[PDB]
Every structure is written in structure tokens, then in C-alpha cells.
């Protein structure tokens, strides 16, 4: 066995191996724009990716991760609801089999075609492994993707996917600039949550941007050519690798705007 997104190992099954799946601060969640409240206590959000150093791209059987060198303070996220410095370690996406679904977070129940997750760990914990043992160990910047005009900055990623079609495959991926995946506005919603895939640890401060980026149908279609399976195994297209919205419970989503 092994958790996945299928009928017999999907999200509704995760709680068995990972009881925290029914926890008090699970992600993703639906973002009710009318209930979210503007928070003046939020400081300006700062995304500094100018010195970002990508190293490799990997198909881990659930999605593909563009990994970065986080041995030094380069690509960092700070400000907003965050206290201290968070360092970028990797980014990945969640997408659907159709344009009408694919995102994990939803806005007023609306599902986007995909969602980009830029993962960062709190530098005061030394490293990622230690950060995931803390309630404020991680910060994930989420960006929605809608199908429309192509996103130039994403093409380098889509063009390397052919080399990592199956689970376990990786490829060198240096000099990729994540700044090319950001929308114009940094307006966002924020709330305390968790990792959206096992181990589903509740160590994440979520920062979801309001403005989605546009990607072309051609670009997302290539995402859908990836495989969940390993080389030589029966083909199971990597699509719908998203977890649905979870109970908000005792939480309040704050807005950085209006
Ligand atoms: C220790 C294994 O590393 C992990 C495991 C799950 C996980 N989920 C996310 S997400 N979808 O951004 O909430 S990033 C991440 C890193
Ligand atoms: Cl299936
Ligand atoms: Zn994710």
C-alpha cells in the first residue's frame, strides 16, 4: 500500500496511518472572502528570491519538486504574519484532470485549475527536519493558477517534465528563478494550518495570494502527462493530486487588504 490520491488510498483514507488528518488545524481550507477580516497588525510581506539557487527537479510520485539550496540565507520569505526568517526549500504544484479543479485551497468554494506551493522553513530551528516539530516551523506561499495566457516563467519547468515522467526520476535544474511565477499583487489571506499531504503536520503558517497567475492550456496539459507510477509500471497519469478543503474549526482567516 501507500497513501496516494486513488479510490483506495486517497485523502479519505489518510487518517488511518496519519490520525492528525482529522486534527484541529488541517489544510487546505475554503477561503470565505466575506468572513475573512482585514488585519492591520500584519506587516508588509517580503519575498526576496533574487539570490535563489535551484538545484534539481524531482518526481516523487505525488507531484514534482523544484528543490533549492537552503544551506545559506538566500531565497527568503518574511514580514506579513511571520516572525523571523523563513527559507525557501522547494516548490511544487497540485493540479486537476480538468481545468475546473486542481487547487487545494478554494475561494468562496471556487476551485482553480492548479495551485503552486513555495515551501519555506523557519531559520531559527536550524533546518527543515527540526522545523516540522514546531507550531510555527513552516510557511507556505500558495498561488492559484487559472488557464488563460501562458506564464513565460513557467516554461522552463514544463519543458523538463519529459525527463522526470515517472516516480523516482530527477534531473538537474539549476538557475531557475521563482520570481517568474509570482503575480503582480502580493495581497493575501493567512491562517494557521498544516502540510496538505502526509505526514500532514500542523506546523504551517499559510499565506495564500489573492491574485492568481495565468498559465496556458498547453502548459497545464503537460503537467497532466506526468505519472504517479514508476518506470515500467502501468501508466497512472499524475492528475488530481489535491486534497479537498478541511474543517476550519477554531480558526480565523485574516486578509492583508481592504
Ligand atoms: C517531510 C516530508 O516533506 C514534506 C511532506 C509533506 C509536505 N506537504 C507540503 S504542502 N502541500 O506544501 O503542504 S510541503 C511538504 C513537505
Ligand atoms: Cl486511479
Ligand atoms: Zn503542496
**From CA 236, how far away is CA 219, in angstroms rounded?**
19
197 lines ligand 1 (CB under 6 A): yes
Number of Cβ atoms within 10 Å of the Cβ of 160 = 16
Pocket test for ligand 1, best of 196, 201, 205, 242 (most atoms within 8 A of CB): 196
Q: Which domains does the chain have, with CATH numbers?
A: 1-258 (3.10.200.10)
Please answer whether residues 224 and 95 qualify as being in contact, where contact means their C-beta atoms are separated by less than 8 angstroms. Answer: yes
* Experimental method reported for this structure: X-ray
CB 200 less than 6 A from any atom of ligand 1: no
Q: Give the Å distances, CA to CA, from 151 to 25, 86, 179.
A: 33, 26, 12
Q: Are 227 and 161 in contact (CB under 8 A)?
A: no
Q: How far apart are CA 180 and CA 31, in angstroms?
A: 25
The DSSP bridge partners found for residue 98 are: none
**Residues 6 or more apart from 221 whose CB is under 8 A from it?**
none
Distance from the alpha carbon of residue 258 to the mean position of ligand 1, in angstroms? 31
Q: How many CA atoms lie within 13 A of 61 on its CB side?
A: 11
Active site residue 15: no
- Decide: 119 in ligand 1 pocket, CB within 6 A: yes
Name the resolution in angstroms. 1.8
How far is 184 from 170, CA to CA, in rounded Å?
31
Counting ligands in written order, the one closest to the CA of 90 is 1
Atom number of ligand 1 nearest to Cα 129: 1
Residues annotated in a binding site: 92, 94, 117, 196-197
SS3 label, residue 153: helix
Amino acid at each position: 500500500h501507500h497513501w496516494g490520491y486513488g479510490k483506495h488510498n486517497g485523502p479519505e483514507h489518510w487518517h488511518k496511518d496519519f490520525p492528525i488528518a482529522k486534527g484541529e488545524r488541517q489544510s487546505p481550507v475554503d477561503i470565505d472572502t466575506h468572513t475573512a477580516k482585514y488585519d492591520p497588525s500584519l506587516k508588509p510581506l517580503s519575498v526576496s528570491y533574487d539570490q535563489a539557487t535551484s538545484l534539481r527537479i524531482l518526481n516523487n510520485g505525488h507531484a514534482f519538486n523544484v528543490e533549492f539550496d537552503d544551506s545559506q540565507d538566500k531565497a527568503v520569505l518574511k514580514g506579513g504574519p511571520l516572525d523571523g526568517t523563513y527559507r525557501l526549500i522547494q516548490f511544487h504544484f497540485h493540479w486537476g484532470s480538468l481545468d475546473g479543479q486542481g487547487s487545494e485551497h478554494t475561494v468562496d468554494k471556487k476551485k482553480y485549475a492548479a495551485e503552486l506551493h513555495l515551501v519555506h522553513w523557519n531559520t531559527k530551528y536550524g533546518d527543515f527536519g527540526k522545523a516540522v516539530q514546531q507550531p510555527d516551523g513552516l510557511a507556505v506561499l500558495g498561488i492559484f493558477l487559472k488557464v488563460g495566457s501562458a506564464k513565460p516563467g513557467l516554461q522552463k519547468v514544463v519543458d523538463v517534465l519529459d525527463s522526470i515522467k515517472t516516480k523516482g526520476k530527477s534531473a538537474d535544474f539549476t538557475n531557475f528563478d521563482p520570481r517568474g511565477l509570482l503575480p503582480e499583487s502580493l495581497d493575501y489571506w493567512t491562517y494557521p494550518g498544516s502540510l496538505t499531504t502526509p505526514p500532514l503536520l500542523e506546523c504551517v503558517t499559510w499565506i495564500v495570494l489573492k491574485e492568481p497567475i495565468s498559465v496556458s492550456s498547453e502548459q497545464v496539459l503537460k503537467f497532466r502527462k506526468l505519472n504517479f507510477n514508476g518506470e515500467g509500471e502501468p501508466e497512472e497519469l499524475m492528475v488530481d493530486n489535491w486534497r479537498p478543503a478541511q474543517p476550519l474549526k477554531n480558526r480565523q482567516i485574516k486578509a492583508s487588504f481592504k
